[PDB]
Amino acid sequence: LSLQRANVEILAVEDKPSPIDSGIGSNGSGIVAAGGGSGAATFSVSQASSDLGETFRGIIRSQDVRSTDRDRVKVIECFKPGDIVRAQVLSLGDGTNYYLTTARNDLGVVFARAANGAGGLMYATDWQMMTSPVTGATEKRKCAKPF
C-alpha cells in the first residue's frame, strides 16, 4: 500500500485459481512467501517462465479506486494488506503489473481481517465499512456489494 497506489497479486481469474499451484509446503515448515526459500535462489530464468508460486501482479491506482471523487481518495481507507479485493482489468500494463480498477459496485474488498490480517474475519456492513463480530469495532474499506 502507498498513497498513490495499491499493489495486489492475482489469485484467481474468473473463478479459476492462478497459478494452479501456489507452492505451499515448498519452502518448509514455517510461514514463507512463494520465493522465500532455497528454491528461489537457484531458479533457472533461462529454462522456465517463473518460479513455483509466482503470480500475475496488479496495481489499483488511487484514481482507479472510485468512479467519483477520484481526486482525493485515501487508499488506506479503501484497502489493507491481506485484503481480498475483487477487481476488473483496465489495461495489460507492463511486464510487471496489470492495471486494475474497483470503480464499480460489485468491485472492491470481498474479504478482510481486523488488525491488518492479524485478527478475525470481518463482514461487510455498509458500502464503506466492515465490522468484526467478536470485537464490535468497525473498520473502513471499499466493500464490493455482495449478492
Partner 1 sequence: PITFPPEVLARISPELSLQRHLSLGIRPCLRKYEEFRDVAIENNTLSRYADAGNIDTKNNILGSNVLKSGKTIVITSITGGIIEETSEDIIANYASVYPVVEVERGRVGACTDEEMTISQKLHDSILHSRILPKKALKVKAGVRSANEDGTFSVLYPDKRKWSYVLYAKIVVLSRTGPVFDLCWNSLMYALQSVKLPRAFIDRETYEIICDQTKSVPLMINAKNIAFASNYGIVELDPECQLQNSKLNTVLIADLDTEAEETSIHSTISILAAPSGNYKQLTLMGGGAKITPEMIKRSLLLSRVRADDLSTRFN
Partner 2 sequence: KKHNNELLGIFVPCNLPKTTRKVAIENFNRPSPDDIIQSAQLN
Partner 3 sequence: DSMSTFIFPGDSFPVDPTTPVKLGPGIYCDPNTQEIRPVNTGVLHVSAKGKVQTAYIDYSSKRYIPSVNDFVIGVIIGTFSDSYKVSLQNFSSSVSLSYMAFPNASKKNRPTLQVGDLVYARVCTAEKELEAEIECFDSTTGRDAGFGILEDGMIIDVNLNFARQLLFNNDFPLLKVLAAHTKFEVAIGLNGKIWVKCEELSNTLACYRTIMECCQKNDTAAFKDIAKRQFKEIL
Question: Which residues of the chain form contacts with partner 2 (CB under 8 A)?
Answer: 66-69, 103, 105, 110-111, 121-128, 133-134, 145-147
**113-132 footprint of partner 3 as x/- string (CB under 8 A):** -xxx-xxx------------
| Burial class (CB within 10 angstroms; exposed 0-12, middle 13-18, buried 19+) of 31 | exposed
CA distance 112 to 139: 10
Q: Which does 127 bind (CB under 5 to 8 A by kind): partner 1, partner 3, partner 2, none?
A: partner 2
Which is nearest to 104 in space by CA: 85, 124, 82? 85
The yes or no reply on residue 2 touching partner 1 (CB under 8 A) is no
Which is nearest to 80 in space by CA: 147, 143, 15? 143
Show contacts with partner 1 in window 56-95 (CB under 8 A). 84
Preceding-residue numbers of gaps in the chain (C–N over 2.5 Å): none
The yes or no reply on residue 80 touching partner 3 (CB under 8 A) is yes
End-to-end CA distance of the chain: 28
Measured from the CB atom, the residue of 53 and 73 that comes closer to partner 1 is 53
Which is nearest to 105 in space by CA: 45, 53, 133, 146? 146
The yes or no reply on residue 1 touching partner 3 (CB under 8 A) is yes
Smallest distance from partner 2 to CB 11, Å: 15
CA dihedral of residues 39, 44, 48, 51 (deg, nearest 10)? 30
Contact residues for partner 3, defined by CB under 8 A: 1-3, 76, 80-81, 114-116, 118-120, 134-135
Contact residues for partner 1, defined by CB under 8 A: 11-12, 15-17, 19-31, 37-39, 42-44, 47-48, 51-52, 84, 110-111, 120-121, 133-134, 146-147
